[PDB]
Amino acid sequence: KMNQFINALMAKMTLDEKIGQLNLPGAGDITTGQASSSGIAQKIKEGKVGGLFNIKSVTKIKEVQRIAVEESRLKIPLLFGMDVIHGYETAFPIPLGLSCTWDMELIEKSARIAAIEASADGICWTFSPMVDISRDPRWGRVSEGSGEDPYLGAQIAKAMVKGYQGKDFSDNTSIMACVKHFALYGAGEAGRDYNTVDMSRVRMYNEYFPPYKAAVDAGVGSVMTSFNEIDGIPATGNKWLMTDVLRKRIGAFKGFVVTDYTAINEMIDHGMGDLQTVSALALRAGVDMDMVGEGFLTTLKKSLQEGKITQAQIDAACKRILEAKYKLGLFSDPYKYCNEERARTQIFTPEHRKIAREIAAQSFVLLKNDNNVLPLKKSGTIALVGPLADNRVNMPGTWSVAAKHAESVSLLEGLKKAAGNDARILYAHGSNLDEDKSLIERATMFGKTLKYDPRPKDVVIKEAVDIANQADVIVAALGESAEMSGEASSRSNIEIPALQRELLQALLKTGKPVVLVLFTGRPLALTWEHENVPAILNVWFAGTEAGDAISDALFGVVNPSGKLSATFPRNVGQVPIYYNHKNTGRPLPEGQWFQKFRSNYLDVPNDPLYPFGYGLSFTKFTYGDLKLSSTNLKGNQTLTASIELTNSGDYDGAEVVQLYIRDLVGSTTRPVKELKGFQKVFLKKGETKTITFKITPEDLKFYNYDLKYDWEPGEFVIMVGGNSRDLKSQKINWLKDPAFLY
Amino acid sequence: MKMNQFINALMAKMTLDEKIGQLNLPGAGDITTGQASSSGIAQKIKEGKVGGLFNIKSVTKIKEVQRIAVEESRLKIPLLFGMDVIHGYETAFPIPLGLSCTWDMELIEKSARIAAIEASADGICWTFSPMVDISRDPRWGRVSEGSGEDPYLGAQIAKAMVKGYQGKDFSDNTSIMACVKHFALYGAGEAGRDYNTVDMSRVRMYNEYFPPYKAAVDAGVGSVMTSFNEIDGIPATGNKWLMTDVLRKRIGAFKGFVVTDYTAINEMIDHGMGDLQTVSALALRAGVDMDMVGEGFLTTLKKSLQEGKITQAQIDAACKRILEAKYKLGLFSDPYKYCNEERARTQIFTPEHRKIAREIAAQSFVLLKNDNNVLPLKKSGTIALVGPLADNRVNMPGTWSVAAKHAESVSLLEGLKKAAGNDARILYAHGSNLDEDKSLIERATMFGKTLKYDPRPKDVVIKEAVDIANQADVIVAALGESAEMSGEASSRSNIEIPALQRELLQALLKTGKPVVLVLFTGRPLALTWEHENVPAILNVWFAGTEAGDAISDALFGVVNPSGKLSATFPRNVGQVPIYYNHKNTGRPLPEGQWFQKFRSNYLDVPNDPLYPFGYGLSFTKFTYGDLKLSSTNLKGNQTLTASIELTNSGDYDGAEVVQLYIRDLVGSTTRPVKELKGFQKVFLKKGETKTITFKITPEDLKFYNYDLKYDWEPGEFVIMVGGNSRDLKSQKINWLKDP
Ligand SMILES: OC[C@H]1O[C@@H](O)[C@H](O)[C@@H](O)[C@@H]1O
Ligand SMILES: OC[C@H]1O[C@@H](O)[C@H](O)[C@@H](O)[C@@H]1O
């Protein structure tokens, strides 16, 4: 069995060969046809390479793996990793957009399909999911995550891990997952990427940690450290974090820890010392694999000779890496993931694209729909206008490194396809992405270019207005470019670019009904748009099928059913503003802004523009009164909470029913509410269904001042609705059972 | 009969109810002169239910109220009389944030001395001051009451403030008991919204936020006020770790009493902590001694005692602490110590006091830009003064000036005309209201701090000012905030000059005439566009009753501006929180290299603030030589002497604030890129050179490490000296421990 086989392996290994297993270097370019004489080859031959990443194609990966199998002393195969974030070649929506589906079945599926494509191409390990909680729309990496809520985040994290890893690591359709970035990366100060993070231990445990824990408990194979410091120690060298929290219950994690890109080396910049010092710190902390920086490879032996680390520390890190490869099936078949036929037939198939088209349409959030503007009639003339109206490579959004960007369906493309002979579609650019070309340049890196019009904005705006005047309705494709979010894409301004707002205004001024189809990787400040635009559909970035999926929604093929996973502020002045907040000692009563001497601003209401969980539909949903099985409970009983949901509008549709719980009094202050459950239900027009939730004390537990995980006896409010804001509710009392106090 | 014996003897005579009554600091209700003894508050005092009262004004009223306790209560225990004396009593000095920019501890202390003198002369023996909350968030209206973002400068000002109020003896009739607030961390409210949640690590508290409070305590501050915010999920007012284990940690004993903020106990109910009895008991157990307004102590402590939820010892200890403050202030030898009509007649708002305020105000201004020798203005030709803040008295003292003679302040128009005389013609024009949106103007001008409002269309009023401006040789635009746009519960999600005023400024610039922006504000503002387009910018904060004269002294060059920012001025609110003493991060952006993908930086704004901590210009120029160090290799408890030649290389006499920064390069935890560790304000005649010297020891190197241990670690440091936290001369050293 595994344990005997790996001890046997390690018994044959030299110190340098163990150290080598901990190395995850950059590959450098590898000339197809002479991989065995390439730069990386020599290091593989000497047993200095544990794995590689962002190598693409089974053909290339196969020949690189051959070097390790045929030309290294012990023939230890490599891991091959990659950033498979929201799909391999078929792009699903960016993670933040996927979160708004609130559909854990759909989400697990997208991961499943992504792992089927990657594994068919020699990839056996993905750097996903990223489950960083964040309350800061300025941070470009909000797009990679799933919002501000620990519960929803935890559910999604589970779905993602289950999707990738499947039923068994050794399946050639399952890949190993890597939860990132441990930890607290989403609280970087001032929303500036990589910036200082600081918070209390109790906040960590209640507000930020749960998603990481769900990934571990779901059996995630690996964990990736984060770039930020915590309590003044970078995550990568933080022993409390990587050892005391991550591996507390011994048998709990069991996987291995990889650093983020040169995160060890960067501890030098942080102010922790030289490369040897920070490398040793990382190993003692519980880090097992060193990404790109080679601090482990170059300094571990010296540190050992110097007594700064121990043999057992090296052996334990090496063991974990081998155990990963063993689980993935690599020792019984180093080429398990290398089949030319799978790669030809199981990637970017018509079936896969179709599923992505279906999923994408379920992620859209309908933020406004006045006067039945949507769905559009498929008749007359429709004017599509804006810098995002006819572009392919931006549709998949950021973190789509293996995506077929150029085969993506543009919005103009999908609209003409949908309209057919029944409606005429007119196009106009309207305006560039921004007035500042240098901003455009840096916002469109990595080949994600937008066609640029050199003419004066007024000329181009007038052009679009003339076209629009010839149409009956106007569809405005505005927002961000794909690379305005993602890594190192922080924005101090979270509005739609000014130039585009000037365009939008000129369109509204035509008197034509306007639909704002919004492309973004983050929450945006949209008060003015909400005030003036008849309809607003948030499409995030929908993937390779964006144009088709969006057209499904626009014409009413699919009834929008998405709901916000993060709060949209009125202005960046409100940040951070989130749903699960404390009451403060001077709360502003609802509807009373402005009140002197309450907690509020002089110049903006306390409320965000759209709250967590917000999402409209083409139809309407009516909630009956909240039914509770009991208002007086004791010990480990089960509370049943039920409610009637009725489709009272004009169309078939789905709605997300949300359960919130409030702990009224506590030994510490409790959030005014916390998401604790949800169910997505489809209803025929006029149909009524009884939705039921089962609450137990487990749902009432929190981390107290002493970090004890428990619930306290007292009153609670149980809330249910399609919003963190609009809810039916009922108070209950829950007591302890003296007999069972252990 | 020393204090301890007397207090013990007294408490032996008191009923439980009388001990509890000493813990009560209620709101007074209206009190009709000539019938105080039959007024609303009178019955409570007679029953012994009142330990103190606050915000009552005038020695006449206070003597009479004190007479109720002295003559009509069973034990004749006199009352404390407190007030918010924040930046002056009737004579108003600049707001504290403004004052902090003087970087002149003597002036800070003197301003507090004059305040104590005035307040004590009018019956006040206790001020709710200094406010020493560290803040990195300019949205927070209360930044105006503090001293900026730096623990060191903050700690220095705290000492200066406490000494100024308290003197060397609590029993002097010119000294009043100070009260450090708001313990603690109040300045980190989320999203800059007053009273909002606070959260942070212990190590950040100790290094970045706690030092000013500790300084006040070590300076001997007589009392401490709790804060409205929670910490680790527990409101400060009910937080035993904070109020006992930190505040009264054995060594460094705080010996004074703790008073809650305004109904802070009752608000713990809203926080989510329980009912009034529960939260009251929590507060007493935490170490709270006096209960402001909410009467939780008064109405619930006995019941808790009966139920064994609190102890007699806890009540006794609190009562004793209150009685000790009264004793120290001399109230048991003379209950009317602070009640002398003649003092109040001769020692308040005197011509001398007003002169001192004028001098101190002028030294608090920060010159943020001065291109092409626009300032100082020549006292000739014609000068146009335009803006919503050009001719208004009541706003000049700014916020937190409840006792100030607002209506007697010197408006900028007034002060200018006076200094001009027959040498220069001052023209005036309104230009614009404070803001479009009247309803915002209204909530921003509460408490009787009203501005003249012009019903005419904005374009009309602008054309009026432009036509006046076009007749002058220079325009002086008085723009910015109103007084109550900052202060308590005055948070702004937008920290620019109000748009209407900027549209006015644009119009004034377009005349082609040189424009000087005289900026009124209680907070750092985002001023990028203004910095790019306005020739000269003078930040005058809120200068107090003498605003007009002090500002004219600067404009004409009577006084050469010498202030330095104590808080960072961001490029936009999207950069917040942005501060000088920050960590390096693992991916720092090299200086001058914005923008770099995969470095710690924004797509749409540079990393740099607009004006950094310690920034401030002069009418003259200062040149620093090279930094001279006595040694670059130190061992144990040696003294390092750092010296530098400073030269007044400009055209005017003037002072500059020489600043000392230190960087600990490597730590067991990450260390800030720099921390202020010393400063000196020095005056230099035109062309004069002086050797400025600092003396550094390991105490200057210490910090709280991961385990909260206060100590220094051996290794390399950078020593930096300059007039600014960004423009520095530096030299690296090695400091080792010894066996
Ligand atoms: O590409 C490997 C890693 O690069 C890092 O810069 C990112 O922060 C990670 O999310 C990514 O997985
Ligand atoms: O007026 C008494 C107290 O009122 C409170 O609302 C403020 O926060 C304190 O600074 C002030 O001293």
Ligand SMILES: [Ca+2]
């Ligand atoms: Ca409870």
Ligand SMILES: [Ca+2]
């Ligand atoms: Ca050091």
